């Protein structure tokens, strides 16, 4: 158990390591604990990331809803969970994604990528601000 910081729980197997990379989580001096392929009651196998004295940026929380929808973000102070929730899905995602339309202007020019995210069971939809094309987030994750 940790005193203060974040525990990202119920991460799908083979996703925990990806999160470490993308959110640059290990680029800190703060103590970190990681469990990969842990046994899970509701999931069977899970990944788990603990980061002391550290909280996810608003950006990272938004990005988490895409990569790991059913994951659990626990906020912790004085050894207690003072905040527990799945990451709130945003309607817009900037910077991190790459439009799969190869003739999109956003590849050649100094602008930040931007997608209108639309939760759409099953696959969540991403519409590019520039080319106006829409894609499954399964396809957009091919950055």
């Amino acid at each position: 158990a940790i005193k203060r910081g974040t525990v990202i729980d119920h991460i799908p197997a083979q996703i925990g390591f990806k999160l470490l990379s993308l959110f640059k989580l290990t680029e800190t001096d703060q103590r970190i604990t990681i469990g990969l392929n842990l046994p899970s009651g509701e999931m069977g196998r899970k990944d788990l990331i603990k980061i002391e004295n550290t909280f996810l940026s608003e950006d990272q929380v938004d990005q988490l809803a895409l990569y790991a929808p059913q994951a659990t973000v626990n906020r912790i102070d004085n050894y207690e969970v003072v905040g527990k929730s799945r990451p709130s899905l945003p309607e817009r995602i900037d910077n991190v994604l790459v439009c799969p339309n190869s003739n999109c202007i956003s590849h050649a020019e100094p602008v930040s990528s931007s997608f209108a995210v639309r939760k759409r069971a099953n696959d969540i939809a991403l519409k590019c601000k520039y080319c106006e094309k829409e894609f499954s987030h399964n396809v957009v994750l091919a950055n």
């Binding site: 339309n101 003739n103 999109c104 202007i105 956003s106 050649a108 020019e109 100094p110 602008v111 590019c128 601000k129 520039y130 080319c131 106006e132 094309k133 829409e134």
Partner: protein, 310 residues
């Protein structure tokens, strides 16, 4: 100020039915009663990074008919973007310190939208961005349909040819779907079908559409037969089997057409419309072209003037 004053005109998706009606009403008025000094003291940039005959020349003619001056280029090869490595962002950043509006056509999707991010208070008018949108084509298309049909609702509209890469039909379908009870017939190669996002839009609004492998299937039903060119400069090499027009309209295919049916085509045509069609009463693609003048004048007047009185 009028609802379009100082607005960017990028995508039909950002315009309402009232917006489109306003341009059409304004276009009808300017056609009936010219305003040669409406845009006096305006200088407008005409920036075409991609080939054009109708869109550039009608746009520039329109500016002159309203008394504005014009600067720009019909090719990017002799701009600093062409020879010195300049980004499009920077290009727009400087040109928008010179002019009162920017008309732009460009080979990539999104170019116009991007321009709006560097153009500050200077409005950008999308003359075509890759295979995405072509708003002013839709404006003159609507104007033409209205003129010949007396209405923009409860129409039977066939769109033929390259629907996938046809920015013309992307914008037109979205516009007609803002009106009531229109019905669509899509006649296209499988590889060049109307994109799913257009279809989904039609579904959400409860608009009827269907696919057909022949013009004759629907000739007797249509009020507007809208023909398109295969966009070969847009095709992936894998799609080269579709370079030739799959559907070829000839004068003899019109024998069972409704008397008041019009054949439209944003042009240029290659072979998808035979020249023997030109003399039939149904041919209206050149009159359609002509209407680009009044639609584009209307759009320019509304964007650059707070109020018009006519």
């Amino acid at each position: 100020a009028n609802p379009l004053y100082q607005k960017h005109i990028i995508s039909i998706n950002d315009l309402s039915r009232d917006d489109l009606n306003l341009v059409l009403a304004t276009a009808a008025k300017l056609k009936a009663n010219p305003q040669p000094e409406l845009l006096k003291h305006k200088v407008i940039a005409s920036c075409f990074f991609e080939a054009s005959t109708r869109t550039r020349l009608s746009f520039e003619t329109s500016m002159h008919r309203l008394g504005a001056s014009v600067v720009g280029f019909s090719d990017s090869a002799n701009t600093s973007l062409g020879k010195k490595g300049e980004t499009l962002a920077d290009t727009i950043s400087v040109i928008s310190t010179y002019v009162d509006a920017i008309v732009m056509r460009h080979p990539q999707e999104g170019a116009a939208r991007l321009a709006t991010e560097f153009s500050g208070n200077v409005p950008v008018l999308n003359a075509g961005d890759g295979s995405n949108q072509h708003p002013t084509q839709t404006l003159l298309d609507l104007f033409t349909i209205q003129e010949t049909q007396g209405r923009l609702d409860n129409l039977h509209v066939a769109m033929v040819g390259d629907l996938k890469y046809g920015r013309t039909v992307h914008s037109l379908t979205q516009a007609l779907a803002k009106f009531d009870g229109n019905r669509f017939y899509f006649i296209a190669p499988d590889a060049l079908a109307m994109p799913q996002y257009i279809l989904d839009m039609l579904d959400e609004k409860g608009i009827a559409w269907s696919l057909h492998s022949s013009i004759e299937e629907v000739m007797a039903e249509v009020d507007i037969l809208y023909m398109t060119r295969v966009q070969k400069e847009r095709l992936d090499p894998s799609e080269y089997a579709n370079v030739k027009a799959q559907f070829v309209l000839r004068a003899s295919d019109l024998h069972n057409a409704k008397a008041n049916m019009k054949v439209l085509h944003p042009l240029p045509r290659v072979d998808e419309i035979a020249t023997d069609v030109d003399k039939t009463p149904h041919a209206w693609y050149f009159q359609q072209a002509g209407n680009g003048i009044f639609a584009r004048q209307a759009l320019l007047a509304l964007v650059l003037n707070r109020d018009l009185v006519l």
